[PDB]
Amino acid sequence: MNLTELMERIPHLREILNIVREAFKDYDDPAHDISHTFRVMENASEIASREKCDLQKAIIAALLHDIKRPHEALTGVDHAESGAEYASGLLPTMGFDISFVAEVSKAIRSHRTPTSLTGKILQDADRLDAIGAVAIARVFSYPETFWTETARKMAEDRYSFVVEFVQRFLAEWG
Amino acid sequence: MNLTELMERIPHLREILNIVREAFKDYDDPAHDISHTFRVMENASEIASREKCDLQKAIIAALLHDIKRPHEALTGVDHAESGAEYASGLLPTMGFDISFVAEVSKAIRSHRTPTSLTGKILQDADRLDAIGAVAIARVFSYPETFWTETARKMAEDRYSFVVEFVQRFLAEWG
Ligand SMILES: [Cl-]
Ligand SMILES: [Cl-]
Ligand SMILES: [Fe+3]
Ligand SMILES: [Fe+3]
Ligand SMILES: [Fe+3]
Ligand SMILES: [Fe+3]
């Protein structure tokens, strides 16, 4: 799904994306910048769709999970705790119900085990970002551990691509 | 083949490698540094072996083909012309015969069409270095056009890997 499609399915998505962009304004650590959050949300979208789980919870949790990363860089306050508290304050103002907000907040709180489906999907989505083509590109610019079967398959696929990349690099280097 | 194996088959290889290293000492342009020459020689080794062509000529031509690149950077004198003249002077002193030296020299002279098997292999080996895993890594740190069937297959393989890399990058980026 593209963003237009996500915005058709997820309430307040545009405003949440906006808030996330604003939070990350001038936080450019390539290891933790905003593009990571967008890739995590793409991974969460794939996983939740294929697992037949709650997409709204998964997407929102992914968008918000590192929203307090810049704040941690300034203060040393743990971003998972801070991000969970932030989600609990923000989300009720957008009409999300108590159980929805509690699940999203707990997922963020647990992301660095998680106990909910949203938390498991979030953690998988986050950790998948350490592997693949973009991860390879980042290194140069500077699978059984996953909860869900969909993430495990994605991890296997990305890992096998990374292995091939290394093998080729070494074979070509001589 | 590893270098020990090449040194078992190719006269004066160690001394030639030594001379090449010395030529490149303090020439660090990542687009034209010594590691390119070594990758070209690896490509030439594969191609000449599989094509049942003269390995000695192919290897030596690959090692020497850009030996005057650093000199071109300083003077503007074309490295293909300069490299061919250099090979014609150096190689007879190592006991290579007139026809061998002329072929290697012409191959270097023509590498930027070539008319000999050595020149065709050299050009393929050189141009293959623009694609593949190491080429991808270089970009981030900063097939039917090939003469031989072996290079065409290698080019197809590397190009299909590059395409997959791009596709994955884009899919992951969101
Ligand atoms: Cl959780
Ligand atoms: Cl030629
Ligand atoms: Fe995090
Ligand atoms: Fe994260
Ligand atoms: Fe050249
Ligand atoms: Fe070259």
Coordinates of C-alpha atoms and ligand atoms in Angstrom, one line a residue:
Chain A
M1 CA 0.0 0.0 0.0
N2 CA 0.9 3.6 -0.8
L3 CA 0.2 6.4 1.7
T4 CA -3.0 7.4 0.0
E5 CA -4.3 3.9 0.4
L6 CA -3.2 3.9 4.1
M7 CA -4.9 7.3 4.6
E8 CA -8.1 5.7 3.2
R9 CA -8.0 3.0 5.9
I10 CA -6.4 4.6 8.9
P11 CA -8.0 7.5 10.8
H12 CA -5.9 10.5 11.4
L13 CA -3.0 9.1 9.5
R14 CA -2.0 12.3 7.8
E15 CA -1.9 14.3 11.1
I16 CA 0.1 11.5 12.8
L17 CA 2.6 11.4 9.9
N18 CA 2.8 15.2 10.2
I19 CA 3.6 15.1 14.0
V20 CA 6.2 12.4 13.3
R21 CA 7.9 14.6 10.7
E22 CA 7.9 17.5 13.0
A23 CA 9.4 15.4 15.9
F24 CA 12.2 14.4 13.6
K25 CA 12.9 17.9 12.2
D26 CA 16.7 18.4 12.6
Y27 CA 17.4 14.9 14.0
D28 CA 19.6 13.4 11.3
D29 CA 21.4 10.5 12.9
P30 CA 21.4 8.0 9.9
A31 CA 21.0 5.1 12.4
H32 CA 17.8 6.5 13.8
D33 CA 16.3 9.1 11.4
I34 CA 12.8 9.4 10.2
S35 CA 13.3 7.2 7.2
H36 CA 13.7 4.3 9.6
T37 CA 10.2 4.9 10.9
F38 CA 8.7 5.0 7.5
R39 CA 10.4 1.7 6.6
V40 CA 9.2 0.1 9.8
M41 CA 5.7 1.2 9.0
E42 CA 6.0 -0.4 5.5
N43 CA 7.2 -3.6 7.2
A44 CA 4.3 -3.5 9.7
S45 CA 1.8 -2.9 6.9
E46 CA 3.0 -6.0 5.1
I47 CA 3.1 -8.1 8.2
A48 CA -0.3 -7.1 9.6
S49 CA -2.0 -7.5 6.3
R50 CA -0.6 -11.0 5.7
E51 CA -1.2 -12.1 9.3
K52 CA -4.8 -11.0 9.2
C53 CA -4.1 -8.8 12.3
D54 CA -5.2 -5.2 13.1
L55 CA -3.6 -2.9 10.6
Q56 CA -4.6 0.3 12.3
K57 CA -2.9 -0.6 15.5
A58 CA 0.2 -1.9 13.7
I59 CA 0.7 1.2 11.5
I60 CA 0.1 3.7 14.3
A61 CA 2.4 1.8 16.6
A62 CA 5.1 1.8 13.9
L63 CA 4.7 5.5 13.2
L64 CA 4.9 6.4 16.8
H65 CA 7.4 3.8 18.1
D66 CA 10.5 6.0 17.8
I67 CA 8.8 9.4 18.1
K68 CA 10.8 10.1 21.3
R69 CA 14.1 9.0 19.8
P70 CA 15.2 12.6 19.2
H71 CA 14.1 13.4 22.8
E72 CA 16.3 10.5 24.1
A73 CA 19.3 11.9 22.2
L74 CA 18.8 15.2 24.1
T75 CA 17.9 13.8 27.5
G76 CA 18.9 10.2 28.0
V77 CA 15.2 9.4 28.8
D78 CA 14.3 6.0 27.4
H79 CA 12.4 6.5 24.1
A80 CA 10.2 3.4 24.5
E81 CA 8.8 4.6 27.9
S82 CA 8.6 8.2 26.7
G83 CA 6.9 7.1 23.4
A84 CA 4.4 4.9 25.1
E85 CA 3.4 7.8 27.4
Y86 CA 3.2 10.1 24.4
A87 CA 0.9 7.7 22.5
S88 CA -1.4 7.4 25.6
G89 CA -1.8 11.2 25.6
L90 CA -2.1 11.8 21.9
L91 CA -4.3 9.0 20.7
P92 CA -7.4 9.6 22.9
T93 CA -7.6 13.1 21.4
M94 CA -8.0 11.5 18.0
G95 CA -11.0 9.4 19.1
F96 CA -9.2 6.1 19.6
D97 CA -10.8 4.0 22.3
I98 CA -9.2 2.9 25.6
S99 CA -8.4 -0.6 24.6
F100 CA -6.9 0.5 21.3
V101 CA -4.7 3.2 22.9
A102 CA -3.5 0.8 25.7
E103 CA -2.5 -1.8 23.1
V104 CA -0.6 0.6 21.0
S105 CA 1.1 2.2 24.0
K106 CA 2.1 -1.2 25.5
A107 CA 3.5 -2.2 22.1
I108 CA 5.7 0.9 22.0
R109 CA 6.7 0.4 25.6
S110 CA 7.9 -3.1 24.9
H111 CA 9.7 -2.6 21.5
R112 CA 13.3 -2.7 22.6
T113 CA 9.2 -9.4 25.4
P114 CA 6.1 -7.9 23.8
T115 CA 2.8 -9.6 24.9
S116 CA 0.3 -8.3 22.3
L117 CA 0.0 -9.1 18.6
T118 CA 0.6 -5.4 17.9
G119 CA 3.8 -5.5 20.0
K120 CA 5.1 -8.6 18.3
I121 CA 4.4 -7.2 14.8
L122 CA 6.0 -3.9 15.8
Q123 CA 9.1 -5.6 17.1
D124 CA 9.4 -7.7 14.0
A125 CA 8.9 -4.7 11.7
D126 CA 11.5 -2.7 13.6
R127 CA 14.1 -5.5 13.6
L128 CA 13.6 -6.3 9.9
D129 CA 15.1 -2.9 9.2
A130 CA 18.6 -4.1 10.2
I131 CA 18.7 -6.3 7.0
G132 CA 18.2 -6.0 3.3
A133 CA 19.3 -3.8 0.5
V134 CA 18.8 -0.5 2.3
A135 CA 20.7 -1.8 5.3
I136 CA 23.6 -2.7 2.9
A137 CA 23.5 0.7 1.4
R138 CA 23.7 2.3 4.9
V139 CA 26.7 0.3 5.8
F140 CA 28.6 1.7 2.8
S141 CA 27.3 5.2 3.2
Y142 CA 28.6 5.4 6.8
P143 CA 15.3 -15.2 10.7
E144 CA 14.1 -17.7 13.4
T145 CA 14.2 -14.8 16.0
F146 CA 11.1 -13.2 14.6
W147 CA 7.6 -13.5 16.2
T148 CA 5.5 -13.8 13.1
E149 CA 5.7 -16.2 10.2
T150 CA 5.4 -13.4 7.7
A151 CA 8.4 -11.6 9.3
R152 CA 10.4 -14.8 9.4
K153 CA 9.9 -15.3 5.7
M154 CA 10.8 -11.7 5.0
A155 CA 13.9 -12.0 7.2
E156 CA 14.9 -15.2 5.4
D157 CA 14.5 -13.5 2.1
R158 CA 16.4 -10.4 3.1
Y159 CA 19.2 -12.4 4.8
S160 CA 19.7 -14.6 1.8
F161 CA 20.0 -11.5 -0.3
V162 CA 22.6 -10.1 2.1
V163 CA 24.6 -13.3 2.0
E164 CA 24.6 -13.3 -1.8
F165 CA 25.7 -9.7 -1.8
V166 CA 28.7 -10.6 0.5
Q167 CA 29.6 -13.7 -1.6
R168 CA 29.5 -11.6 -4.8
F169 CA 31.5 -8.8 -3.2
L170 CA 34.2 -11.2 -2.1
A171 CA 34.2 -13.1 -5.4
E172 CA 34.5 -9.8 -7.4
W173 CA 37.1 -8.3 -5.0
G174 CA 39.5 -11.2 -5.7
Chain B
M1 CA 42.6 -18.8 -9.1
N2 CA 44.4 -17.2 -6.2
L3 CA 47.7 -15.2 -6.7
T4 CA 49.9 -18.2 -5.7
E5 CA 48.3 -20.2 -8.5
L6 CA 48.7 -17.3 -11.0
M7 CA 52.3 -17.0 -10.0
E8 CA 52.8 -20.8 -10.7
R9 CA 51.5 -20.2 -14.3
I10 CA 52.6 -16.7 -15.3
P11 CA 56.3 -15.7 -15.6
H12 CA 57.3 -12.6 -13.7
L13 CA 54.0 -12.1 -12.2
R14 CA 55.2 -11.1 -8.8
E15 CA 57.6 -8.5 -10.2
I16 CA 54.8 -7.1 -12.4
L17 CA 52.4 -6.9 -9.5
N18 CA 55.1 -5.2 -7.5
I19 CA 55.6 -2.6 -10.3
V20 CA 51.9 -2.0 -10.5
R21 CA 51.6 -1.4 -6.7
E22 CA 54.5 1.0 -6.9
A23 CA 52.9 2.9 -9.8
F24 CA 49.7 3.4 -7.8
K25 CA 51.4 4.3 -4.5
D26 CA 49.6 7.5 -3.5
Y27 CA 47.0 7.5 -6.3
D28 CA 43.8 7.0 -4.3
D29 CA 41.0 8.1 -6.7
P30 CA 38.3 5.5 -5.8
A31 CA 37.2 5.5 -9.4
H32 CA 40.6 4.4 -10.7
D33 CA 42.7 3.1 -7.8
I34 CA 44.7 -0.1 -7.8
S35 CA 41.9 -2.3 -6.6
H36 CA 40.2 -1.8 -10.0
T37 CA 43.3 -3.3 -11.7
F38 CA 43.1 -6.3 -9.4
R39 CA 39.4 -6.8 -10.1
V40 CA 40.0 -6.5 -13.9
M41 CA 42.7 -9.1 -13.7
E42 CA 40.3 -11.4 -11.8
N43 CA 37.7 -10.9 -14.5
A44 CA 40.3 -11.5 -17.2
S45 CA 41.5 -14.7 -15.5
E46 CA 37.9 -16.1 -15.5
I47 CA 37.2 -15.0 -19.1
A48 CA 40.5 -16.3 -20.6
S49 CA 40.3 -19.6 -18.8
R50 CA 36.7 -20.3 -19.9
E51 CA 37.3 -19.0 -23.5
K52 CA 40.3 -21.3 -23.8
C53 CA 42.4 -18.3 -24.7
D54 CA 45.9 -17.2 -23.7
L55 CA 45.8 -16.6 -19.9
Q56 CA 49.4 -15.1 -19.7
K57 CA 48.6 -12.4 -22.3
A58 CA 45.2 -11.6 -20.6
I59 CA 46.5 -11.4 -17.1
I60 CA 49.5 -9.3 -18.0
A61 CA 47.5 -7.0 -20.1
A62 CA 44.9 -6.5 -17.3
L63 CA 47.7 -5.8 -14.7
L64 CA 49.3 -3.2 -17.0
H65 CA 46.3 -1.7 -18.7
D66 CA 45.9 1.2 -16.3
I67 CA 49.5 1.5 -15.0
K68 CA 49.7 4.9 -16.6
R69 CA 46.5 6.2 -15.0
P70 CA 48.3 8.0 -12.2
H71 CA 50.5 9.5 -14.9
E72 CA 47.5 10.7 -16.9
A73 CA 46.1 12.3 -13.7
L74 CA 49.3 14.4 -13.4
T75 CA 50.0 15.2 -17.1
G76 CA 46.9 14.7 -19.3
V77 CA 48.8 12.2 -21.4
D78 CA 46.4 9.4 -22.5
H79 CA 47.0 6.3 -20.3
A80 CA 46.1 3.8 -23.0
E81 CA 48.9 5.2 -25.3
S82 CA 51.3 5.6 -22.4
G83 CA 50.5 2.2 -21.0
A84 CA 51.1 0.5 -24.3
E85 CA 54.4 2.2 -24.8
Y86 CA 55.4 1.2 -21.2
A87 CA 54.5 -2.5 -21.8
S88 CA 56.6 -2.5 -25.0
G89 CA 59.5 -1.4 -23.0
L90 CA 59.1 -3.5 -19.9
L91 CA 58.0 -6.8 -21.2
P92 CA 61.1 -7.6 -23.5
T93 CA 63.3 -7.2 -20.4
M94 CA 61.4 -10.1 -18.8
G95 CA 62.0 -12.4 -21.7
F96 CA 58.6 -12.2 -23.5
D97 CA 58.9 -12.5 -27.2
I98 CA 58.1 -10.0 -29.9
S99 CA 54.7 -11.3 -30.8
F100 CA 53.6 -11.6 -27.2
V101 CA 54.7 -8.1 -26.3
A102 CA 53.0 -6.6 -29.5
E103 CA 49.7 -8.3 -28.7
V104 CA 49.7 -7.2 -25.0
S105 CA 50.8 -3.6 -26.0
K106 CA 48.1 -3.3 -28.7
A107 CA 45.5 -4.6 -26.3
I108 CA 46.3 -1.9 -23.8
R109 CA 46.5 0.7 -26.5
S110 CA 42.9 -0.2 -27.6
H111 CA 41.2 -0.6 -24.3
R112 CA 39.3 2.6 -24.0
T113 CA 37.6 -1.4 -31.2
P114 CA 40.3 -3.9 -30.1
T115 CA 41.4 -6.4 -32.8
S116 CA 43.0 -9.2 -30.9
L117 CA 41.6 -11.8 -28.5
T118 CA 43.7 -10.3 -25.7
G119 CA 42.3 -6.9 -26.5
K120 CA 38.7 -8.1 -26.5
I121 CA 39.1 -10.0 -23.3
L122 CA 40.8 -7.0 -21.7
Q123 CA 38.0 -4.6 -22.7
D124 CA 35.4 -7.0 -21.4
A125 CA 37.3 -7.5 -18.1
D126 CA 37.6 -3.7 -17.7
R127 CA 34.0 -2.9 -18.5
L128 CA 32.6 -5.7 -16.2
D129 CA 34.0 -3.7 -13.3
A130 CA 31.2 -1.1 -13.7
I131 CA 28.6 -3.6 -12.5
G132 CA 28.0 -5.9 -9.6
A133 CA 28.2 -5.9 -5.8
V134 CA 31.5 -4.0 -5.5
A135 CA 30.2 -1.4 -8.0
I136 CA 27.0 -1.0 -5.8
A137 CA 29.1 -0.6 -2.7
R138 CA 31.2 2.1 -4.5
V139 CA 28.2 4.1 -5.4
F140 CA 27.1 4.3 -1.8
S141 CA 30.6 4.9 -0.4
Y142 CA 31.1 8.0 -2.7
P143 CA 25.4 -7.4 -21.4
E144 CA 25.1 -7.7 -25.2
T145 CA 27.8 -5.1 -25.6
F146 CA 30.6 -7.5 -24.5
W147 CA 32.9 -9.3 -26.9
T148 CA 33.1 -12.7 -25.3
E149 CA 30.3 -15.1 -24.4
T150 CA 31.8 -15.6 -20.9
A151 CA 31.8 -11.9 -20.3
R152 CA 28.2 -11.6 -21.6
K153 CA 27.1 -14.2 -19.2
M154 CA 29.0 -12.6 -16.3
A155 CA 27.5 -9.2 -17.3
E156 CA 24.0 -10.7 -17.4
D157 CA 24.4 -12.2 -14.0
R158 CA 25.9 -9.0 -12.4
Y159 CA 23.2 -6.8 -14.1
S160 CA 20.4 -9.0 -12.9
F161 CA 21.9 -8.8 -9.3
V162 CA 22.0 -5.0 -9.6
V163 CA 18.4 -4.9 -10.8
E164 CA 17.3 -7.0 -7.9
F165 CA 19.3 -4.7 -5.5
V166 CA 17.4 -1.7 -6.9
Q167 CA 14.0 -3.3 -6.8
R168 CA 14.6 -4.4 -3.2
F169 CA 15.9 -0.9 -2.2
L170 CA 12.8 0.7 -3.6
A171 CA 10.4 -1.9 -2.1
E172 CA 12.0 -1.5 1.3
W173 CA 12.3 2.3 1.2
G174 CA 8.5 2.5 0.8
Ligands
CL1 CL 3.2 -5.6 23.7
CL2 CL 43.7 -5.3 -29.5
FE3 FE 13.2 2.2 19.0
FE4 FE 12.9 1.6 15.5
FE5 FE 41.8 2.5 -18.5
FE6 FE 40.6 0.0 -16.3

